[PDB]
């Protein structure tokens, strides 16, 4: 009769490769913050009395 049809057993299948190499990287972060003035002076009086002008 027949009809066996044995496939080839040995395949050793294909893979995908990349070849990595040495490389320099800079590590940098990003942090929140507020802006402040260089000098702030709160004008407070040093005597007592009515503001005339």
């Amino acid at each position: 009769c027949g009809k066996s049809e044995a496939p080839p057993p040995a395949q050793t299948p294909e893979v995908g490769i990349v070849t990595l190499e040495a490389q320099t990287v800079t590590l940098n972060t990003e942090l929140p913050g507020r802006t402040n003035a260089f000098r702030i002076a709160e004008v407070r009086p040093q005597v007592n009395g009515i503001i005339l002008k």
Binding site: I40, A41, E42
Partner: protein, 52 residues
């Protein structure tokens, strides 16, 4: 001069020395000397601020 007049004069002299020492303390206070040695942080007030 009497010994009592000298005893009064040097007493007034030492009282004036104590008064000028009291003034030297307040002159020393306006330069804020650091009370201990260590790491200082940041200034909570800037130039132009009124303190008490």
């Amino acid at each position: 001069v009497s010994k009592q007049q000298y005893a009064d004069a040097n007493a007034a002299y030492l009282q004036s020395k104590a008064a000028v020492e009291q003034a030297r303390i307040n002159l020393r206070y306006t330069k804020v000397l650091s009370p201990i040695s260590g790491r200082i942080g940041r200034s909570a007030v800037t130039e132009g601020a009124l303190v008490t």
